Amino acid sequence: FQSMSDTMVVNGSGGVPAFLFSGSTLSSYRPNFEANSITIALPHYVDLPGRSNFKLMYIMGFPIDTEMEKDSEYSNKIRQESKISKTEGTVSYEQKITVETGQEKDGVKVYRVMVLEGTIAESIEHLDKKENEDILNNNRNRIVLADNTVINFDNISQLKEFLRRSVNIVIFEMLRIDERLRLKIYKDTEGYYTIGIGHLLTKSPSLNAAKSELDKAIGRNTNGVITKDEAEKLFNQDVDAAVRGILRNAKLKPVYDSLDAVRRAALINMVFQMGETGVAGFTNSLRMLQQKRWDEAAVNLAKSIWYNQTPNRAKRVITTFRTGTWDAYKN
Amino acid sequence: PAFLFSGSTLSSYRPNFEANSITIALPHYVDLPGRSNFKLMYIMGFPIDTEMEKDSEYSNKIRQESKISKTEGTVSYEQKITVETGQEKDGVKVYRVMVLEGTIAESIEHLDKKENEDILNNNRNRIVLADNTVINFDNISQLKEFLRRSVNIVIFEMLRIDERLRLKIYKDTEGYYTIGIGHLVITKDEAEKLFNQDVDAAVRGILRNAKLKPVYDSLDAVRRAALINMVFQMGETGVAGFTNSLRMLQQKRWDEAAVNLAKSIWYNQTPNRAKRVITTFRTGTWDAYKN
């Protein structure tokens, strides 16, 4: 006679998903269903609010997104792929996104939702969690865009670095307006050679020393000129160091992680302007931001030499601290 | 339910959908053949059993509890059982199936897999019987002891005849202090547990012995009892020294063994027990003991 033994392992190319109920899911939307705790072990189907072709199946409290070629009752229709590349291209800041991990074969798709309708910043933090490392490393990782098209990534690292790019362009564009992008070396007000977006090259008065330091930074013979793309890299590196210093700061680090990445960037904006301890010495204005009283914090920030010395820039940053969007930057 | 999708399941049922595919990540509902009130839901290769008082599309009606004692009752060894583990809250039952319509012997071996320790230790264990009633067990050890008591029904009667069920401490025929059933005051229950333990021992000792393990695999449950019986009397090493007769079972030829056992000093030293065991070996039945 015949005994079936079913265990845990997933040893081959059948497309069974690995660690389907591991890790955690970040969701900005709660399901409800039933009052009995012990039936989340049972399948619960629900449509995602305001969407189409986006039925979810909840099980063990996790959302699973499911697609089928053959017409189905509980499965979604197959989603088309986006024309946004995985290697380059980005998704815009004001769109939510859904991050998934899982499998597909012969017109059947089963994907564990890791991030349900969250921001790019939130997803970046979420996928970086250690508990999630197992499910993201042994499955196919994709992003389901707002328009319900899909971007498939070759690996988790490619996705998160895609997302790293998606957030970082915005701080670049913003800072381009406030500080200027310079693709040739230029000597600034005090007499320091600079390039890109406010990147100091050297503490030496020699242009040659600057041209040499720029070469050292880019890793080629530049002759004092760089491309928009290299400038962006230098910027990203500078951003990363600015966030570094914000964490080593006792007054900035707290108000930092308590803001949405848009406001976090408004802080980075000041850091680029008046240095880390200058911004640090604002004190009273930070606490009002922490408390999420934007209209009041904006009023205190205006009461400053900074608002006085740079009116137009200070308004854009302050309006960015009111409405946690990039509304202040247009045209 | 802790570890709900951990360990392994043994099943005598073959589902009507593809195994080992992405396909199993979607739920499948089967209505177990021949069984009334026995809907199951498969997910990720595991069957989940559910009871709700409320009327439902993919659930079972609340199952009646069996009147069989969880502490000293048995289920007939001729019957398949289902073994489940899980939780109950507010009229709703969620049980992961560990053994689906398996024999008692199959269940005992499967519930001993270390991969299953965590889940049997941390949820409620119950047997769903052939007639759809259930025995709920206080803890998994009690279940294990229940099963063990159900397969040993026969070997117990055999050895209680040959070696006697003694409650108060008596002296074995070698100076050894012996209680229960040839075990080196208590109640008949306390003895039965010791016996289960000593049957475990003998079987473990038999497998671990090079000479006995192969000849033991080529035996049906009844002839196994005969072999276990011999080990209870003389030990693994003594039994294993019966190479002549011993090989005749590994060639499945009896009768030629029934007399090549009476050749022994063993037969001459304890003729009554030995004729019985020999007869048991010959017929592969219990007709030597049923009196």
Closest among B7, B61, B31 to A8, alpha carbons compared: B7
Name the residue among A4, A36, A64 with its Cβ closest to that of B89.
Answer: A36
Mutate to test the interface with A, among B20, B100, B107 (most CBs of A within 10 A): B20
Mutate to test the interface with B, among A1, A5, A6 (most CBs of B within 10 A): A6
Q: Are A126 and A136 in contact (CB under 8 A)?
A: no
Q: What's the CA angle centered on B271, arms B270 and B273, to 5 degrees?
A: 75
CA A146 to CA B135: how far, in whole Å? 52
- In chain A, the residue whose alpha carbon lies closest to the alpha carbon of B47 is A6
Q: Which residues of A touch B2 (CB under 8 A)?
A: none
Looking at the domain that runs over B152-291, which CATH code has it been given? 1.10.530.40
User: Which runs of consecutive H residues, i.e. helices, occur in chain B?
Assistant: 104-110, 117-121, 140-151, 153-162, 188-207, 213-217, 221-240, 243-249, 256-259, 265-269, 271-283
A320: helix, coil or strand? helix
Q: Which fold has domain A169-331?
A: Lysozyme (1.10.530)
Six-digit token string for A103: 């499998």
Residue in A47, A164, A184, A169 with CA at minimum distance from that of residue A116: A47
**Deposited experimental method:** X-ray
Amino acid at B96: R
**A318 C-beta neighbours (distance < 10 Å), count:** 22
- Is B157 noted as a catalytic residue in this protein? no
Q: Round the CA-based radius of gyration of chain A to a whole number and report it.
A: 24
Distance CA B199, CA B150 (A): 13
Instruction: Sketch the domain layout of chain B as residue ranges.
Output: 1-151, 152-291
With beta carbons less than 8 A apart as the criterion, state whether A280 and A273 touch: no
Distance CA A308, CA A320 (A): 18
Q: Is A43 on the interface with B (CB under 8 A)?
A: yes
Using the Cβ of A13 and the Cβ atoms of chain B, whether some distance falls under 8 Å is answered with no
Q: How many CB pairs under 8 A join A and B?
A: 93
Chain A CB contacts of B25 below 8 Å: 16-17, 20, 64, 103, 110
| Chain B CB within 8 Å of residue A2 CB | yes
What is the spatial distance between Cα B9 and Cα B99, in angstroms, rounded to a whole number?
6
| The residue count for chain B | 291
Identity of the residue in A2, A15, A38 whose CB atom sits nearest the CB atom of B22: A15
Q: Is the dihedral of CA B41, A110, A62, A49 positive or negative?
A: negative
Taking CA atoms, A260 is separated from A122, A168, A286, B136, in Å, by 9, 14, 14, 52
Whose structure tokens read 């979607």? B26
Q: Please state whether A148 falls in left (phi above 0), alpha (psi between -120 and 50) or beta.
A: left
A6, A41, A110 ranked by CB distance to B22: nearest: A110
Is residue A163 classed as helix, strand or coil in its secondary structure? helix
Residues in CB range of A90: below 8 A, 6 or more apart: A84, A162, A165, A166, A169
H/E stretch holding A87: none
Catalytic (active-site) positions of A: 179, 188
Active site residue B55: no
Q: Say if A108 is an interface residue toward chain B (CB within 8 Å).
A: yes
% helix, strand, coil for chain A, step of 5: 40, 20, 40
Which residues, including other chains, have CB under 8 Å from residue B150's CB and lie 6 or more apart?
B74, B75, B76, B77, B104
Nearest chain B Cα distance for residue A112, angstroms: 10
A135 at the B interface (CB within 8 A)? no
Partner B contacted by A143 (CB < 8 A): no
